[model samples]
Target: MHHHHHHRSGDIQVQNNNTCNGKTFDYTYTVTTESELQKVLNELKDYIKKQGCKRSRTSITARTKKEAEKFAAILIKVYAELGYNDINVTWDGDTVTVEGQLEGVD
Candidate 1:
């Protein structure tokens, strides 16, 4: 069986939803704008607080520009470790979109 979904970060939309041996994925997120960084991270923090994923406080420290960059790098690393390598951040005229997915099977 095969399934798919579309994700949009900028002008381009990447598709994810591949599966194998009953395992599938849909790991993709986008940072709408620089100004929304803090708010966005806070939201993510809140979402993971119950389950307690790694890097909780780091998400809150995303207020500073430097910290935000570091935060992005950290997330990229995490997603990569989770088997998502088809990842990239591209600027389409000012829009920053970060998308990641496994190049092959889960």
Candidate 2:
């Protein structure tokens, strides 16, 4: 299903949804440049930190498959650096999803 919105170039739409397990964060980036992507990543990092890395799921939607993969790799490294041991980055088409539990959380 597709939804229409009046999003401008380089705009990012974020959705934080509550679920039975916890909250999930989703970011759809209407990025046309590298800097926009970087900005979105920065925002995502901030959100994660604020949530104490307790998010049950996180997804980033890029404009292209290549960008999706690139961001997914970047996120994998960042998550590791932030001590998220079990996190997994999986991509399909223009979307990359990260799933798993944070370190030291049972």
Candidate 3:
């Protein structure tokens, strides 16, 4: 799908509707320059939290530790930027979940 929005962030967030694969995706990724990395990561993290995701499910076949670290880093950075730095990340060596405090995030 081709998406374009006028939102200030200029991001097009895709929802996992289970319309095709019978599963929804709650992952957010981006290719950004050094200066924009933190902001983008933080935004992605907030987006995941807003969607009620505990952690992200990544493809071990297609991504490596370095890539996963990048993803995880952005996720943490995003929450930290929002003052939700106290996040708990759990990994079963396959899926990763990110959780917020009782304060919760909107």
**Best prediction by lDDT:** 2
TM-score leaderboard ranking: 2, 3, 1
Model 3 scores what on Cα lDDT? 0.42
Rate residue 39 of model 3 by lDDT.
61
Error of 3 at 66 (Å): 3.9
lDDT of each: 0.37, 0.56, 0.42
List the lowest-lDDT window of 10 residues for candidate 2. Answer: 13-22
Per-residue CA lDDT of candidate 2, range 1-106, in tens? 5655445643433232323432434444465456666676676655555555454355665667787777667677655655665566677755677654544544
Q: Write one digit per residue (lDDT tens) for candidate 3, span 1-106.
A: 7655344332322122111222334444433233554564545444544554344322211133444455455545555664567755554333344444446566
Q: Is candidate 1 or candidate 2 better by lDDT?
A: 2
- Candidate 1 per-residue C-alpha lDDT over 1-106 given as tens digits, one digit per residue, 9 for 90 to 100: 5544334432121222222212222222344344544454444433333332221222212334554455556445544554444445443322233444424553
Stretches of model 3 off by over 4 angstroms after superposition: 1-62, 103-106
Tell me the TM-score of each prediction against the true structure.
Answer: 0.29, 0.56, 0.38
